[PDB]
Amino acid sequence: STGSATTTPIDSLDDAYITPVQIGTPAQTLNLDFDTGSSDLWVFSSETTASEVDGQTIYTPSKSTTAKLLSGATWSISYGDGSSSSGDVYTDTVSVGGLTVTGQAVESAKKVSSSFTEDSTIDGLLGLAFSTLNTVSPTQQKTFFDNAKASLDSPVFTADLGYHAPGTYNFGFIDTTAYTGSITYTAVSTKQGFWEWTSTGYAVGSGTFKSTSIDGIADTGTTLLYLPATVVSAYWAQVSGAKSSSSVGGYVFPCSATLPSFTFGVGSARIVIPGDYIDFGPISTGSSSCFGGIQSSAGIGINIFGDVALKAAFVVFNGATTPTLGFASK
């Protein structure tokens, strides 16, 4: 089997991407944030505190004939941006783009934090990191990909995120028409539960390539590119008027400046992030100060190849016995 679904930016800045997901019988379609940095499939639901729901589409398990309470199970997750949610668990039928998993753990939110309430476009998350990060207790549950894996034609999924445009998530096959050149594969460590790999270096605009190991995660659920402070400083030093603003919480730059590209290494291959991808617009409406899409990872404790980086590539998440990551230009 295979599946293929279109993923769509939630807003004009590509702050996140939503993908339609069918849950239950009859199908209830929710727009979920596919997140290769976490491993819980959770949804806004009929059980969510009423004051914490504002415009989201909810899953109602009582209306699904295939829904079963996972008795005694609870879940509770916190994300890197301080947001969080928690609740109980049902198993139900979940389909993505024609690919169906029966008995998928669907984590029903009883509580969500403010940032989730305040975003009407995201109905929940569908985690695609390793199942060892799943927060369900007492019995940890498997991700959608983990459950699907053995039925897939090939044990892989791919992320093809668009710049200010829709893209595609595919399961079970590699669309050879979706990228240029070759796919370069690179080693993955699963020790922290992430798609964790080591970039071979970077270049800023037309600058020479700096060979240096950068350990980080391929994280579709993170908007920006978070790299070591040395690297980020070298980037913004090439932008006239750019500065790190404590009040804003990162590098900003005059909206009138031209942004250089940023290149990252994948083995001997190179992925080029165009300068425009690094522009996240005015810090507040009407401001001439624009927020940067490359920021310091200092104090996160890990480097994050988020959407800014991944959308410049066709990315293979290879779930073979020994997982690997592949990157192609497109």
Swiss-Prot record:
Reaction catalysis annotation: Hydrolysis of proteins with specificity similar to that of pepsin A, prefers hydrophobic residues at P1 and P1', but does not cleave 14-Ala-|-Leu-15 in the B chain of insulin or Z-Glu-Tyr. Clots milk
The enzyme's E.C. designation: 3.4.23.22
Source organism, top-level taxon: Eukaryota
Record: active site: 35, 199
Disulfides per UniProt: 255-290
Molecular function per GO: aspartic-type endopeptidase activity
Keyword list, A-Z: Aspartyl protease, Disulfide bond, Hydrolase, Protease, Signal, Zymogen
Domain Peptidase A1 span(s) in chain numbering: 17-328
GO BP: proteolysis
Family to which this protein belongs: Belongs to the peptidase A1 family.
Protein's recorded name: Endothiapepsin
Organism listed in the record: Cryphonectria parasitica (Chestnut blight fungus)
Lineage: Eukaryota, Fungi, Dikarya, Ascomycota, Pezizomycotina
GN (gene name): EAPA
Portion of the parent chain present: 90 to 419 of 419
